[PDB]
Ligand binder design. Structure first.
Ligand SMILES: Cc1[nH]c(/C=C2\C(=O)Nc3ccc(C(=O)N[C@H](C)c4ccc(F)cc4)cc32)c(C)c1NC(=O)[C@@H]1CCC(=O)O1
Length: 503
């Protein structure tokens, strides 16, 4: 559903328009060739043109497949990689890996195989590409092309860039619509924040805090920010669309109430990965409850309402009694200094509630007051049933440890301690992070699962920062706008837009 003249809109600028970009973009190999989706492709495409580099991309691709290969098929895929890339007479032989590293990874295969057999060689490969190949790509026409894509990425974003459809959701500070990018046709969900309502309630720094947190995290399991623009009477956050419902609905309306343990395992594993990505930015979510875990078209889940999220200064704690009754960790209820520990308590609440069909401190058929619900969270030991395996009972009561110091995942190890818990003994997190595990429930597509101050002007410029880099480049790729516009001259020659002779 791209606009009729979308090639006019995403028309590349002439390379001469990008000289300011060429001298302001930092030339970090990991950023330009890996983190940024379109840079990664363009650099990979540069190595396709060279005979020697070609084989280093193919090899890294086969190591990626090795990491997510099933355990009982490792020895099979490992030998294949060895005999194809690490044999002296191979036509696609890897040379920069010293023979003291090809004969070393021979021994790993002479014994049991691990998922990281080729981690030693993959870094050796990357260390080579960082140097001579990367600096050649900088002086190649593929980096000029990257500068053209960046020039587009930075173009201003306004109401016309989008196309609002239906008001799908409401709440506080505004409503949530469903929009579409006219030029690419990709769907998002606007979070229209009414302008007059923010100044009145005096929550400007809270609206920025959420926008900053959303754009800084890029996770498969948290809603991502793709655009932030201002308009008349509102500020807009363009977020990942979640059309599959929310976990609360599936627990109580589609559930028994509740899920099978294996089904709750899948959602728990994805939620745990979401929290881990947030904690990589020392950001605590503080708002874990089932109605905030949303499902998508394919049945995967993302954490949603980041309105109560805050970035902890490293080495420092925060105070704040905030959340929803029944999902506040004991240290939050007491209004103490805490860090990331509330999110692991919230994870305990979620695994328990998914499995049992009710909250661990309030019966589904129980009428109790906020005071009793809070007393239980601070003084009562939750009980379990035959719906829980011993492994499930363990992780839940370890995560529901009242004392945040002895609570699972609240150590220096972090989320790694949780992924190692026997409750995930049968879960492969590499394959889960790669989207290779079929969700337990796939939503049906057609389904419906349910004033003139200047201080206000300065507050907008910090918020309305335009498009977000990684999501924008991923949009251009999903919609095949990249595949379509990224064209060069016939037989590896310069197209006109990259030739400084005739503009
Ligand atoms: C197509 C779409 N999008 C959604 C919402 C969301 C989404 O996708 N990501 C989100 C990320 C964060 C938040 C959030 O925390 N919102 C707070 C409350 C808020 C509200 C108003 C404000 F002004 C500010 C904050 C919300 C969202 C929904 C339910 C649907 N529809 C549907 O799920 C169903 C299924 C299929 C259909 O057609 O109906």
């Amino acid at each position: 559903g791209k606009s009729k003249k979308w090639k006019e809109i995403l028309k590349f600028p002439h390379i001469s328009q990008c000289e300011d970009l060429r001298r302001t973009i930092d030339r970090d190999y990991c950023s330009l060739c890996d983190k940024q989706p379109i840079g990664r492709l363009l650099f990979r495409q540069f190595c396709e043109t060279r005979p020697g580099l070609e084989c280093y991309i193919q090899f890294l691709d086969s190591v990626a497949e090795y990491e997510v290969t099933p355990d009982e098929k490792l020895g099979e895929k490992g030998k294949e990689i060895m005999t194809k890339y690490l044999t002296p007479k191979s036509p696609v032989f890897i040379a920069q890996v010293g023979q003291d590293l090809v004969s070393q990874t021979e021994e790993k295969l002479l014994q049991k195989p691990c998922k990281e057999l080729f981690s030693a060689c993959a870094q050796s490969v990357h260390e080579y590409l960082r140097g001579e190949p990367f600096h050649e790509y900088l002086d190649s026409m593929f980096f000029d092309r990257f500068l053209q894509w960046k020039w587009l990425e930075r173009q201003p974003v306004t109401k016309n860039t989008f196309r609002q459809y239906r008001v799908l959701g409401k709440g506080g500070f505004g409503e949530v619509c469903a929009c579409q990018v006219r030029a690419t046709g990709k769907m998002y969900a606007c979070k229209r924040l009414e302008k007059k309502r923010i100044k009145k309630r005096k929550g400007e720094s809270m609206a920025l805090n959420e926008k900053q947190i959303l754009e800084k995290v890029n996770s498969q399991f948290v809603v991502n920010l793709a655009y932030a623009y201002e308009t008349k009477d509102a500020l807009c956050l363009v977020l990942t669309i979640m059309n599959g419902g929310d976990l609360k609905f599936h627990i109580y309306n589609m559930g028994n109430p509740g899920f099978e343990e294996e089904r709750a395992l899948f959602y728990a594993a994805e939620i745990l990965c979401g929290l881990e990505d947030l904690h990589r930015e020392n950001t605590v979510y503080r708002n874990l409850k089932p109605e905030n875990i949303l499902l998508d078209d394919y049945g995967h889940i993302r954490i949603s309402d980041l309105g109560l999220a805050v970035k902890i200064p490293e080495g420092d704690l925060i105070r704040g009694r905030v959340g929803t009754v029944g999902y506040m960790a004991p240290e939050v209820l007491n209004n103490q200094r805490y860090g990331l520990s509330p999110d692991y308590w919230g994870l305990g609440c979620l695994i328990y509630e998914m499995i049992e069909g009710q909250s661990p401190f309030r019966g589904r058929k129980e009428k109790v007051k906020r005071e009793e619900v809070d007393r239980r969270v601070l003084e009562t030991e939750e009980v379990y049933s035959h719906k829980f395996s011993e492994e499930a009972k363990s992780i839940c009561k370890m995560l529901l440890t009242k004392d945040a110091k002895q609570r699972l995942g609240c150590q220096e190890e972090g989320a790694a301690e949780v992924k190692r818990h026997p409750f995930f003994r049968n879960m492969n997190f590499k394959r889960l992070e790669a989207g290779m595990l079929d969700p337990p429930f796939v939503p049906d597509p057609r389904a419906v699962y349910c004033n003139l101050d200047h201080t206000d002007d300065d507050f907008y410029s910090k918020f309305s920062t335009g498009s977000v880099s990684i999501p924008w480049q991923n949009e251009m790729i999903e919609t095949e706008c990249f595949k379509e516009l990224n064209v060069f001259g016939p037989n590896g020659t310069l197209p006109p837009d990259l030739n400084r002779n005739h503009p």
